[PDB]
Amino acid sequence: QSLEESGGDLVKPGASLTLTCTASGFSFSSGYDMCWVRQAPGKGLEWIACIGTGSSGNIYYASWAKGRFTISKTSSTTVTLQMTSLTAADTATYFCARDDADYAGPDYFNLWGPGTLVTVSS
Amino acid sequence: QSLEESGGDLVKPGASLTLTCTASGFSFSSGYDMCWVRQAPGKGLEWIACIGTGSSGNIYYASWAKGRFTISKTSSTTVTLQMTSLTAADTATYFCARDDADYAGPDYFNLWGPGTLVTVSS
Amino acid sequence: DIVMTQTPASVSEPVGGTVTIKCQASESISNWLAWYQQKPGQPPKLLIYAAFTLASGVPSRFKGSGSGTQFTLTINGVECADAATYYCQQTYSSRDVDNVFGGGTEVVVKG
Amino acid sequence: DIVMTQTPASVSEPVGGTVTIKCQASESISNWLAWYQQKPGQPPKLLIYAAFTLASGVPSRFKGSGSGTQFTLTINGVECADAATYYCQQTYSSRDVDNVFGGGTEVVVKG
Amino acid sequence: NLCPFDEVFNATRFASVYAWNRKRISNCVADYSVLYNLAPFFTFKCYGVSPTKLNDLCFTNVYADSFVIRGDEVRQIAPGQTGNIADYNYKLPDDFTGCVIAWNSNKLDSKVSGNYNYLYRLFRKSNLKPFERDISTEIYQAGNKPCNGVAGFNCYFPLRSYSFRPTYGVGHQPYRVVVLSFELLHAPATVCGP
Amino acid sequence: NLCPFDEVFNATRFASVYAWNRKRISNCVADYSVLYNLAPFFTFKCYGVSPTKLNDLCFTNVYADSFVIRGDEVRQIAPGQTGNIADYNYKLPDDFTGCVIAWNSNKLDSKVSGNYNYLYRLFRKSNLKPFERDISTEIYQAGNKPCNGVAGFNCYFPLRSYSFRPTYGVGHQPYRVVVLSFELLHAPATVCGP
């Protein structure tokens, strides 16, 4: 299975973007949880958000991204994440990881997407 | 395997008949219980008797046929039922069914024979 | 000793319905009961043994329910091929009993 | 809530040697933890889930140890194919946490 | 007017533990010496009255409850015990009076093919109060999504069948259990010994 | 200033039994009426104090230890008890004070693929002293030739994983357990009921 990423392009600071996570070979069933993480070009991994793919998605957020970001499931094989008010420190590679247990939170990430690069520059 | 029955024919009132149940594809082992039931042309099922094919047969009779009927095993694959003094109400289809547990009585009837027609008339 | 009665005598519903048949015993017979099905001109066929377990090769539409003195059989979907007669057998104590089988219930599927 | 740290920042040990990486949590996380490995320009790969169990297809050299608040991961022998960055994840309580992942440890195999 | 112990004890088929029978014994003389030939290997450990002096005593009202259980579960039929049978099938009051009898019945209730007619309740919302029978067959919801009559995962049928294995020890063999509940009330004595 | 019972009881994931969690409760009012919505089907059997009159009483210091065990092993959490969990995972002192609570959590800690994240210690040199934790993962030497880090024949890993099987009864289901230890010492009262 694959979780190829899209919607990654250069954006001027103080604008909005909307990345998409698309599955292949499976659909977002209630068994597994989804998450979005990011990695700066020179730093370590940072967790951004998680959404459940069940009857009642338990959407979570990191403290540093309490309200800036918005993650939502839009179809059976597409989950999108939207950011607003981007700054020069938001440039990074974003990965759409899939969880292995829906305990309302990001558990072990068994499968990862290739990730796409988002850069913020004027 | 089958239990085709024989000896079904018209008998004048106040006479006697001896029907025979013959097993096909197996012989009367001690693990199973045999039974005879009857059904009127337009009424429900009525149970007549049972004999166990073990070392000590637990012959059982219904109340309505306490002394009129008599069931006996005669060979390794043949069990006969004989009635005396058939009346006008004894016309029916007689089935030779096989049980599935030897609890000294008719348990669930897993296998049924095609049954034979016995009519009483002048 | 133990005598059962089966009700109703006859039932009728369109093809889409569910039928329920009741069989009640004079005394408690616990879990020993059997629901048989007889089509016209055929020997009866076992449907429900042990009052809950489906027989072998029986479609998963006949649900047995209840225990003690009241038992019910329910067909959740009839298909014009279930028009037959249904019987309940006590198989509990057959020492001095007039008839183990209950009365006959005739089912009519008016498709 | 739970803030985690990983040490050392960078290590360098010969090919036949052993390397050890420690990861410590502020509050007790019991057994919930996972060690991931990321090669340059690659998505991270799960190595040690549940803090002791090896993942599928991972060589039998990465051993995890410790529980509660302090954990260690050890490579008993490097072979120049294990130069990457290793991360520890709490996966215990993420209601309000800035980052589940710990800091990165860059491992250099001085073959 | 001897009490009807033989029909309760020498019955060919006993009830399943969940749907246990209940019989009333009244207006008769009860004898205990007979309960050696009808019940071999009996075990009359019991509560509320000394077994040795049961001969010279009168009982106001007697209830007999009979069923079939496993060999190792017979210890669960006792006041204050906790377990599967005690919680979901047959619960006895703490201040119980009357005597329990259990005897091995491998020769009577074991089949070569396998006994699949004796059932016991395995899932239940809450423990039974003393002396209460649950004959419901409603599907059990062990998860979060409603079962709606489907028997998939996290949706189990509450009743299971006894898989007797006589090849193993007596803990895997069918034991027939008969419980007598005595009492002493305002009514004059009607059931007495010989 | 309400005590943090919500955090302890309504935590999404509890600790493994061998590495049980520990929490301190102090300088707050403890309300026990909350322990019905958060913990269904609980069993509040406990030691050292009457559970009902806990409302009008003051406790010197309260410790809360939480973990997850099997259904059949819940009876091993009691002073003086002997077994696997009692010896090698969690020992309660004989003069124990405080109350234990256990509730079924099949709806929270059961996975279709299989729960392999909860571990328990199976081998050990000697029984745990009361209130002690052993997180060592040293390979266990069950023979004569030293293991030297090998896990081959006669050389076993001391920790195993709980294989919950909800198909069976509640005896094979994950039960969440929280043990509260009160006390009475020279320090003045700081935790009291409403």
Side-chain angles (χ1 to χ4, degrees), chain B residues 39 45-47 60 62-64 105-109 112-114, chain C residues 33-34 36 38 43-44 50 89 91 94-95 97-100:
Chain B
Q39 180 182 4
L45 292 203
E46 301 186 70
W47 165 63
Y60 264 50
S63 64
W64 63 269
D107 298 331
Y108 318 124
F109 288 136
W112 294 75
Chain C
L33 185 85
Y36 291 80
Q38 161 164 111
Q89 185 198 7
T91 181
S94 57
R95 184 91 81 161
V97 174
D98 63 337
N99 185 4
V100 285

PDB file of all heavy atoms in Angstrom, chain B residues 39 45-47 60 62-64 105-109 112-114, chain C residues 33-34 36 38 43-44 50 89 91 94-95 97-100:
ATOM      1  N   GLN B  39     -48.407 -40.960  10.448  1.00  0.00           N
ATOM      2  CA  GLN B  39     -49.060 -39.694  10.139  1.00  0.00           C
ATOM      3  C   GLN B  39     -50.360 -39.961   9.404  1.00  0.00           C
ATOM      4  O   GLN B  39     -50.356 -40.615   8.359  1.00  0.00           O
ATOM      5  CB  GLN B  39     -48.160 -38.799   9.287  1.00  0.00           C
ATOM      6  CG  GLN B  39     -48.802 -37.474   8.936  1.00  0.00           C
ATOM      7  CD  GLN B  39     -47.922 -36.617   8.062  1.00  0.00           C
ATOM      8  OE1 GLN B  39     -46.844 -37.038   7.648  1.00  0.00           O
ATOM      9  NE2 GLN B  39     -48.372 -35.401   7.780  1.00  0.00           N
ATOM     10  N   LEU B  45     -48.038 -35.422  12.967  1.00  0.00           N
ATOM     11  CA  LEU B  45     -47.227 -36.602  13.220  1.00  0.00           C
ATOM     12  C   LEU B  45     -47.607 -37.242  14.548  1.00  0.00           C
ATOM     13  O   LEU B  45     -47.910 -36.550  15.522  1.00  0.00           O
ATOM     14  CB  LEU B  45     -45.746 -36.233  13.227  1.00  0.00           C
ATOM     15  CG  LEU B  45     -45.136 -35.805  11.894  1.00  0.00           C
ATOM     16  CD1 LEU B  45     -43.633 -36.002  11.905  1.00  0.00           C
ATOM     17  CD2 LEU B  45     -45.755 -36.569  10.752  1.00  0.00           C
ATOM     18  N   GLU B  46     -47.598 -38.571  14.580  1.00  0.00           N
ATOM     19  CA  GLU B  46     -47.839 -39.332  15.797  1.00  0.00           C
ATOM     20  C   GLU B  46     -46.733 -40.358  15.974  1.00  0.00           C
ATOM     21  O   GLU B  46     -46.394 -41.084  15.037  1.00  0.00           O
ATOM     22  CB  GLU B  46     -49.196 -40.030  15.755  1.00  0.00           C
ATOM     23  CG  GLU B  46     -50.364 -39.083  15.579  1.00  0.00           C
ATOM     24  CD  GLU B  46     -51.702 -39.781  15.679  1.00  0.00           C
ATOM     25  OE1 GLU B  46     -52.066 -40.211  16.793  1.00  0.00           O
ATOM     26  OE2 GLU B  46     -52.393 -39.898  14.646  1.00  0.00           O
ATOM     27  N   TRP B  47     -46.173 -40.415  17.177  1.00  0.00           N
ATOM     28  CA  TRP B  47     -45.103 -41.350  17.488  1.00  0.00           C
ATOM     29  C   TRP B  47     -45.680 -42.668  17.982  1.00  0.00           C
ATOM     30  O   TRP B  47     -46.629 -42.685  18.768  1.00  0.00           O
ATOM     31  CB  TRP B  47     -44.167 -40.759  18.541  1.00  0.00           C
ATOM     32  CG  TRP B  47     -43.273 -41.765  19.170  1.00  0.00           C
ATOM     33  CD1 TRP B  47     -42.315 -42.506  18.554  1.00  0.00           C
ATOM     34  CD2 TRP B  47     -43.256 -42.149  20.546  1.00  0.00           C
ATOM     35  NE1 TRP B  47     -41.699 -43.329  19.461  1.00  0.00           N
ATOM     36  CE2 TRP B  47     -42.260 -43.128  20.693  1.00  0.00           C
ATOM     37  CE3 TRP B  47     -43.987 -41.760  21.671  1.00  0.00           C
ATOM     38  CZ2 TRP B  47     -41.975 -43.723  21.916  1.00  0.00           C
ATOM     39  CZ3 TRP B  47     -43.704 -42.350  22.882  1.00  0.00           C
ATOM     40  CH2 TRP B  47     -42.708 -43.321  22.996  1.00  0.00           C
ATOM     41  N   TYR B  60     -39.837 -48.927  23.844  1.00  0.00           N
ATOM     42  CA  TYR B  60     -40.724 -47.920  24.402  1.00  0.00           C
ATOM     43  C   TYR B  60     -41.966 -47.785  23.536  1.00  0.00           C
ATOM     44  O   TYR B  60     -41.919 -47.928  22.313  1.00  0.00           O
ATOM     45  CB  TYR B  60     -40.007 -46.571  24.516  1.00  0.00           C
ATOM     46  CG  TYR B  60     -39.433 -46.305  25.882  1.00  0.00           C
ATOM     47  CD1 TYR B  60     -38.640 -47.244  26.516  1.00  0.00           C
ATOM     48  CD2 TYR B  60     -39.689 -45.115  26.539  1.00  0.00           C
ATOM     49  CE1 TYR B  60     -38.117 -47.004  27.765  1.00  0.00           C
ATOM     50  CE2 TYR B  60     -39.170 -44.865  27.785  1.00  0.00           C
ATOM     51  CZ  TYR B  60     -38.385 -45.811  28.395  1.00  0.00           C
ATOM     52  OH  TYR B  60     -37.862 -45.566  29.642  1.00  0.00           O
ATOM     53  N   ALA B  62     -45.966 -45.723  22.997  1.00  0.00           N
ATOM     54  CA  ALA B  62     -46.831 -44.606  23.338  1.00  0.00           C
ATOM     55  C   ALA B  62     -48.022 -45.101  24.145  1.00  0.00           C
ATOM     56  O   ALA B  62     -48.333 -46.294  24.165  1.00  0.00           O
ATOM     57  CB  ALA B  62     -47.308 -43.889  22.078  1.00  0.00           C
ATOM     58  N   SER B  63     -48.688 -44.168  24.825  1.00  0.00           N
ATOM     59  CA  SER B  63     -49.828 -44.544  25.653  1.00  0.00           C
ATOM     60  C   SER B  63     -50.981 -45.066  24.809  1.00  0.00           C
ATOM     61  O   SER B  63     -51.651 -46.031  25.189  1.00  0.00           O
ATOM     62  CB  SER B  63     -50.281 -43.355  26.495  1.00  0.00           C
ATOM     63  OG  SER B  63     -50.755 -42.311  25.668  1.00  0.00           O
ATOM     64  N   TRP B  64     -51.230 -44.442  23.657  1.00  0.00           N
ATOM     65  CA  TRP B  64     -52.377 -44.809  22.837  1.00  0.00           C
ATOM     66  C   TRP B  64     -52.221 -46.162  22.160  1.00  0.00           C
ATOM     67  O   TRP B  64     -53.192 -46.660  21.583  1.00  0.00           O
ATOM     68  CB  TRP B  64     -52.632 -43.732  21.785  1.00  0.00           C
ATOM     69  CG  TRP B  64     -51.518 -43.564  20.801  1.00  0.00           C
ATOM     70  CD1 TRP B  64     -50.455 -42.721  20.910  1.00  0.00           C
ATOM     71  CD2 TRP B  64     -51.369 -44.238  19.549  1.00  0.00           C
ATOM     72  NE1 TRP B  64     -49.646 -42.834  19.809  1.00  0.00           N
ATOM     73  CE2 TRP B  64     -50.187 -43.760  18.957  1.00  0.00           C
ATOM     74  CE3 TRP B  64     -52.119 -45.201  18.871  1.00  0.00           C
ATOM     75  CZ2 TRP B  64     -49.736 -44.211  17.723  1.00  0.00           C
ATOM     76  CZ3 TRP B  64     -51.669 -45.647  17.645  1.00  0.00           C
ATOM     77  CH2 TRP B  64     -50.491 -45.152  17.083  1.00  0.00           C
ATOM     78  N   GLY B 105     -35.100 -43.629  24.445  1.00  0.00           N
ATOM     79  CA  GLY B 105     -36.220 -42.886  23.925  1.00  0.00           C
ATOM     80  C   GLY B 105     -35.901 -42.197  22.615  1.00  0.00           C
ATOM     81  O   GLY B 105     -34.748 -42.140  22.176  1.00  0.00           O
ATOM     82  N   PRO B 106     -36.928 -41.657  21.966  1.00  0.00           N
ATOM     83  CA  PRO B 106     -36.740 -40.961  20.687  1.00  0.00           C
ATOM     84  C   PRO B 106     -36.156 -39.573  20.885  1.00  0.00           C
ATOM     85  O   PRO B 106     -36.840 -38.651  21.337  1.00  0.00           O
ATOM     86  CB  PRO B 106     -38.163 -40.904  20.116  1.00  0.00           C
ATOM     87  CG  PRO B 106     -39.043 -40.949  21.301  1.00  0.00           C
ATOM     88  CD  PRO B 106     -38.346 -41.767  22.340  1.00  0.00           C
ATOM     89  N   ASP B 107     -34.887 -39.420  20.538  1.00  0.00           N
ATOM     90  CA  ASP B 107     -34.249 -38.116  20.505  1.00  0.00           C
ATOM     91  C   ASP B 107     -34.415 -37.545  19.099  1.00  0.00           C
ATOM     92  O   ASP B 107     -35.263 -37.998  18.328  1.00  0.00           O
ATOM     93  CB  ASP B 107     -32.794 -38.226  20.944  1.00  0.00           C
ATOM     94  CG  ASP B 107     -32.657 -38.720  22.364  1.00  0.00           C
ATOM     95  OD1 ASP B 107     -33.567 -38.463  23.176  1.00  0.00           O
ATOM     96  OD2 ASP B 107     -31.644 -39.380  22.667  1.00  0.00           O
ATOM     97  N   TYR B 108     -33.630 -36.524  18.756  1.00  0.00           N
ATOM     98  CA  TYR B 108     -33.747 -35.898  17.444  1.00  0.00           C
ATOM     99  C   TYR B 108     -33.611 -36.927  16.329  1.00  0.00           C
ATOM    100  O   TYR B 108     -32.691 -37.748  16.333  1.00  0.00           O
ATOM    101  CB  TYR B 108     -32.687 -34.815  17.274  1.00  0.00           C
ATOM    102  CG  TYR B 108     -32.474 -33.944  18.484  1.00  0.00           C
ATOM    103  CD1 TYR B 108     -31.219 -33.818  19.056  1.00  0.00           C
ATOM    104  CD2 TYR B 108     -33.520 -33.231  19.043  1.00  0.00           C
ATOM    105  CE1 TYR B 108     -31.016 -33.016  20.155  1.00  0.00           C
ATOM    106  CE2 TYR B 108     -33.323 -32.425  20.139  1.00  0.00           C
ATOM    107  CZ  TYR B 108     -32.071 -32.324  20.693  1.00  0.00           C
ATOM    108  OH  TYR B 108     -31.869 -31.523  21.790  1.00  0.00           O
ATOM    109  N   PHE B 109     -34.530 -36.874  15.369  1.00  0.00           N
ATOM    110  CA  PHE B 109     -34.553 -37.807  14.245  1.00  0.00           C
ATOM    111  C   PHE B 109     -33.742 -37.212  13.102  1.00  0.00           C
ATOM    112  O   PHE B 109     -34.245 -36.396  12.329  1.00  0.00           O
ATOM    113  CB  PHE B 109     -35.986 -38.086  13.813  1.00  0.00           C
ATOM    114  CG  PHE B 109     -36.755 -38.940  14.772  1.00  0.00           C
ATOM    115  CD1 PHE B 109     -38.057 -38.624  15.108  1.00  0.00           C
ATOM    116  CD2 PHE B 109     -36.181 -40.062  15.330  1.00  0.00           C
ATOM    117  CE1 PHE B 109     -38.767 -39.410  15.983  1.00  0.00           C
ATOM    118  CE2 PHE B 109     -36.891 -40.853  16.207  1.00  0.00           C
ATOM    119  CZ  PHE B 109     -38.185 -40.525  16.533  1.00  0.00           C
ATOM    120  N   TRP B 112     -34.673 -39.944   8.059  1.00  0.00           N
ATOM    121  CA  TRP B 112     -36.024 -40.453   7.894  1.00  0.00           C
ATOM    122  C   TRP B 112     -36.104 -41.324   6.653  1.00  0.00           C
ATOM    123  O   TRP B 112     -35.392 -41.103   5.670  1.00  0.00           O
ATOM    124  CB  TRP B 112     -37.044 -39.321   7.773  1.00  0.00           C
ATOM    125  CG  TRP B 112     -37.213 -38.498   9.000  1.00  0.00           C
ATOM    126  CD1 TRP B 112     -36.358 -37.557   9.485  1.00  0.00           C
ATOM    127  CD2 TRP B 112     -38.319 -38.538   9.900  1.00  0.00           C
ATOM    128  NE1 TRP B 112     -36.864 -37.008  10.637  1.00  0.00           N
ATOM    129  CE2 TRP B 112     -38.070 -37.596  10.911  1.00  0.00           C
ATOM    130  CE3 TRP B 112     -39.496 -39.283   9.947  1.00  0.00           C
ATOM    131  CZ2 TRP B 112     -38.955 -37.379  11.957  1.00  0.00           C
ATOM    132  CZ3 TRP B 112     -40.371 -39.067  10.983  1.00  0.00           C
ATOM    133  CH2 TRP B 112     -40.098 -38.125  11.976  1.00  0.00           C
ATOM    134  N   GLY B 113     -36.983 -42.317   6.708  1.00  0.00           N
ATOM    135  CA  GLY B 113     -37.269 -43.137   5.559  1.00  0.00           C
ATOM    136  C   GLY B 113     -38.456 -42.604   4.785  1.00  0.00           C
ATOM    137  O   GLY B 113     -39.246 -41.804   5.291  1.00  0.00           O
ATOM    138  N   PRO B 114     -38.601 -43.042   3.534  1.00  0.00           N
ATOM    139  CA  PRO B 114     -39.706 -42.536   2.705  1.00  0.00           C
ATOM    140  C   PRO B 114     -41.081 -42.881   3.246  1.00  0.00           C
ATOM    141  O   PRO B 114     -42.058 -42.205   2.902  1.00  0.00           O
ATOM    142  CB  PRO B 114     -39.449 -43.198   1.345  1.00  0.00           C
ATOM    143  CG  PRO B 114     -38.621 -44.395   1.653  1.00  0.00           C
ATOM    144  CD  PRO B 114     -37.764 -44.013   2.816  1.00  0.00           C
TER     145      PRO B 114
ATOM    146  N   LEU C  33     -35.562 -29.891  22.652  1.00  0.00           N
ATOM    147  CA  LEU C  33     -36.648 -29.586  21.734  1.00  0.00           C
ATOM    148  C   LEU C  33     -36.109 -29.671  20.317  1.00  0.00           C
ATOM    149  O   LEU C  33     -34.916 -29.474  20.079  1.00  0.00           O
ATOM    150  CB  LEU C  33     -37.242 -28.200  21.997  1.00  0.00           C
ATOM    151  CG  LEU C  33     -38.471 -27.831  21.168  1.00  0.00           C
ATOM    152  CD1 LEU C  33     -39.732 -28.349  21.825  1.00  0.00           C
ATOM    153  CD2 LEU C  33     -38.546 -26.340  20.951  1.00  0.00           C
ATOM    154  N   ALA C  34     -37.000 -29.960  19.373  1.00  0.00           N
ATOM    155  CA  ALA C  34     -36.582 -30.036  17.981  1.00  0.00           C
ATOM    156  C   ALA C  34     -37.692 -29.513  17.087  1.00  0.00           C
ATOM    157  O   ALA C  34     -38.851 -29.900  17.246  1.00  0.00           O
ATOM    158  CB  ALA C  34     -36.218 -31.471  17.597  1.00  0.00           C
ATOM    159  N   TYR C  36     -39.019 -29.509  13.334  1.00  0.00           N
ATOM    160  CA  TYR C  36     -39.004 -30.258  12.084  1.00  0.00           C
ATOM    161  C   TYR C  36     -39.849 -29.550  11.036  1.00  0.00           C
ATOM    162  O   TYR C  36     -40.837 -28.880  11.351  1.00  0.00           O
ATOM    163  CB  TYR C  36     -39.548 -31.676  12.287  1.00  0.00           C
ATOM    164  CG  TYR C  36     -38.675 -32.596  13.096  1.00  0.00           C
ATOM    165  CD1 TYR C  36     -38.667 -32.536  14.475  1.00  0.00           C
ATOM    166  CD2 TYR C  36     -37.884 -33.547  12.478  1.00  0.00           C
ATOM    167  CE1 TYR C  36     -37.881 -33.381  15.218  1.00  0.00           C
ATOM    168  CE2 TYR C  36     -37.096 -34.399  13.212  1.00  0.00           C
ATOM    169  CZ  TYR C  36     -37.096 -34.310  14.583  1.00  0.00           C
ATOM    170  OH  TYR C  36     -36.307 -35.159  15.323  1.00  0.00           O
ATOM    171  N   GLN C  38     -41.865 -30.353   7.301  1.00  0.00           N
ATOM    172  CA  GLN C  38     -42.383 -31.344   6.362  1.00  0.00           C
ATOM    173  C   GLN C  38     -43.103 -30.619   5.233  1.00  0.00           C
ATOM    174  O   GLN C  38     -44.088 -29.914   5.465  1.00  0.00           O
ATOM    175  CB  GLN C  38     -43.321 -32.330   7.047  1.00  0.00           C
ATOM    176  CG  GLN C  38     -44.219 -33.065   6.068  1.00  0.00           C
ATOM    177  CD  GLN C  38     -44.861 -34.293   6.663  1.00  0.00           C
ATOM    178  OE1 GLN C  38     -46.069 -34.329   6.888  1.00  0.00           O
ATOM    179  NE2 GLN C  38     -44.058 -35.315   6.911  1.00  0.00           N
ATOM    180  N   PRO C  43     -41.016 -36.907   3.687  1.00  0.00           N
ATOM    181  CA  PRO C  43     -40.721 -37.095   5.103  1.00  0.00           C
ATOM    182  C   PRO C  43     -40.222 -35.800   5.715  1.00  0.00           C
ATOM    183  O   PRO C  43     -39.575 -34.985   5.035  1.00  0.00           O
ATOM    184  CB  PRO C  43     -39.619 -38.171   5.097  1.00  0.00           C
ATOM    185  CG  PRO C  43     -39.674 -38.781   3.742  1.00  0.00           C
ATOM    186  CD  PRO C  43     -40.121 -37.695   2.830  1.00  0.00           C
ATOM    187  N   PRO C  44     -40.492 -35.566   6.995  1.00  0.00           N
ATOM    188  CA  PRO C  44     -40.057 -34.315   7.618  1.00  0.00           C
ATOM    189  C   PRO C  44     -38.542 -34.217   7.675  1.00  0.00           C
ATOM    190  O   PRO C  44     -37.833 -35.222   7.727  1.00  0.00           O
ATOM    191  CB  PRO C  44     -40.663 -34.387   9.022  1.00  0.00           C
ATOM    192  CG  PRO C  44     -40.841 -35.838   9.275  1.00  0.00           C
ATOM    193  CD  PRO C  44     -41.167 -36.457   7.951  1.00  0.00           C
ATOM    194  N   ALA C  50     -31.756 -29.041  19.592  1.00  0.00           N
ATOM    195  CA  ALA C  50     -31.342 -28.373  20.825  1.00  0.00           C
ATOM    196  C   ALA C  50     -31.936 -26.977  20.956  1.00  0.00           C
ATOM    197  O   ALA C  50     -31.433 -26.160  21.729  1.00  0.00           O
ATOM    198  CB  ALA C  50     -29.817 -28.308  20.952  1.00  0.00           C
ATOM    199  N   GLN C  89     -40.854 -31.155  18.879  1.00  0.00           N
ATOM    200  CA  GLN C  89     -40.712 -32.425  19.580  1.00  0.00           C
ATOM    201  C   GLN C  89     -39.968 -32.210  20.891  1.00  0.00           C
ATOM    202  O   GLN C  89     -38.967 -31.486  20.935  1.00  0.00           O
ATOM    203  CB  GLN C  89     -39.964 -33.441  18.721  1.00  0.00           C
ATOM    204  CG  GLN C  89     -39.870 -34.820  19.337  1.00  0.00           C
ATOM    205  CD  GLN C  89     -38.786 -35.660  18.705  1.00  0.00           C
ATOM    206  OE1 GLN C  89     -38.007 -35.173  17.890  1.00  0.00           O
ATOM    207  NE2 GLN C  89     -38.730 -36.929  19.079  1.00  0.00           N
ATOM    208  N   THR C  91     -38.416 -34.482  23.072  1.00  0.00           N
ATOM    209  CA  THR C  91     -37.224 -35.304  23.295  1.00  0.00           C
ATOM    210  C   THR C  91     -36.638 -35.183  24.697  1.00  0.00           C
ATOM    211  O   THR C  91     -35.417 -35.225  24.863  1.00  0.00           O
ATOM    212  CB  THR C  91     -36.129 -35.004  22.261  1.00  0.00           C
ATOM    213  OG1 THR C  91     -35.007 -35.852  22.517  1.00  0.00           O
ATOM    214  CG2 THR C  91     -35.657 -33.564  22.315  1.00  0.00           C
ATOM    215  N   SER C  94     -39.833 -39.447  27.505  1.00  0.00           N
ATOM    216  CA  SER C  94     -40.750 -40.207  26.667  1.00  0.00           C
ATOM    217  C   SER C  94     -41.110 -41.549  27.289  1.00  0.00           C
ATOM    218  O   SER C  94     -41.253 -42.541  26.572  1.00  0.00           O
ATOM    219  CB  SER C  94     -40.157 -40.412  25.275  1.00  0.00           C
ATOM    220  OG  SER C  94     -38.905 -41.061  25.357  1.00  0.00           O
ATOM    221  N   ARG C  95     -41.263 -41.600  28.612  1.00  0.00           N
ATOM    222  CA  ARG C  95     -41.645 -42.850  29.257  1.00  0.00           C
ATOM    223  C   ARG C  95     -43.119 -43.156  29.030  1.00  0.00           C
ATOM    224  O   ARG C  95     -43.465 -44.180  28.431  1.00  0.00           O
ATOM    225  CB  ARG C  95     -41.328 -42.786  30.750  1.00  0.00           C
ATOM    226  CG  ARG C  95     -41.603 -44.080  31.491  1.00  0.00           C
ATOM    227  CD  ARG C  95     -40.376 -44.972  31.518  1.00  0.00           C
ATOM    228  NE  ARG C  95     -39.428 -44.574  32.552  1.00  0.00           N
ATOM    229  CZ  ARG C  95     -38.479 -45.361  33.040  1.00  0.00           C
ATOM    230  NH1 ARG C  95     -38.326 -46.604  32.614  1.00  0.00           N
ATOM    231  NH2 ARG C  95     -37.665 -44.890  33.979  1.00  0.00           N
ATOM    232  N   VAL C  97     -45.902 -41.012  27.404  1.00  0.00           N
ATOM    233  CA  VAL C  97     -46.367 -39.830  26.692  1.00  0.00           C
ATOM    234  C   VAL C  97     -47.182 -40.289  25.494  1.00  0.00           C
ATOM    235  O   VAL C  97     -46.783 -41.211  24.777  1.00  0.00           O
ATOM    236  CB  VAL C  97     -45.193 -38.934  26.250  1.00  0.00           C
ATOM    237  CG1 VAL C  97     -45.694 -37.786  25.396  1.00  0.00           C
ATOM    238  CG2 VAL C  97     -44.446 -38.408  27.457  1.00  0.00           C
ATOM    239  N   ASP C  98     -48.337 -39.654  25.286  1.00  0.00           N
ATOM    240  CA  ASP C  98     -49.177 -40.021  24.152  1.00  0.00           C
ATOM    241  C   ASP C  98     -48.496 -39.705  22.826  1.00  0.00           C
ATOM    242  O   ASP C  98     -48.559 -40.502  21.884  1.00  0.00           O
ATOM    243  CB  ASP C  98     -50.525 -39.307  24.249  1.00  0.00           C
ATOM    244  CG  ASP C  98     -50.393 -37.803  24.175  1.00  0.00           C
ATOM    245  OD1 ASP C  98     -49.296 -37.290  24.482  1.00  0.00           O
ATOM    246  OD2 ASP C  98     -51.380 -37.135  23.802  1.00  0.00           O
ATOM    247  N   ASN C  99     -47.832 -38.556  22.737  1.00  0.00           N
ATOM    248  CA  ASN C  99     -47.246 -38.106  21.479  1.00  0.00           C
ATOM    249  C   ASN C  99     -46.159 -37.095  21.794  1.00  0.00           C
ATOM    250  O   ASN C  99     -46.434 -36.073  22.429  1.00  0.00           O
ATOM    251  CB  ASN C  99     -48.313 -37.488  20.580  1.00  0.00           C
ATOM    252  CG  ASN C  99     -47.781 -37.109  19.219  1.00  0.00           C
ATOM    253  OD1 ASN C  99     -46.623 -37.362  18.900  1.00  0.00           O
ATOM    254  ND2 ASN C  99     -48.627 -36.489  18.408  1.00  0.00           N
ATOM    255  N   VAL C 100     -44.929 -37.377  21.361  1.00  0.00           N
ATOM    256  CA  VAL C 100     -43.855 -36.410  21.554  1.00  0.00           C
ATOM    257  C   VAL C 100     -44.073 -35.190  20.670  1.00  0.00           C
ATOM    258  O   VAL C 100     -43.845 -34.052  21.095  1.00  0.00           O
ATOM    259  CB  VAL C 100     -42.488 -37.063  21.297  1.00  0.00           C
ATOM    260  CG1 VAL C 100     -42.111 -37.961  22.451  1.00  0.00           C
ATOM    261  CG2 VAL C 100     -42.515 -37.856  20.012  1.00  0.00           C
TER     262      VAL C 100
END
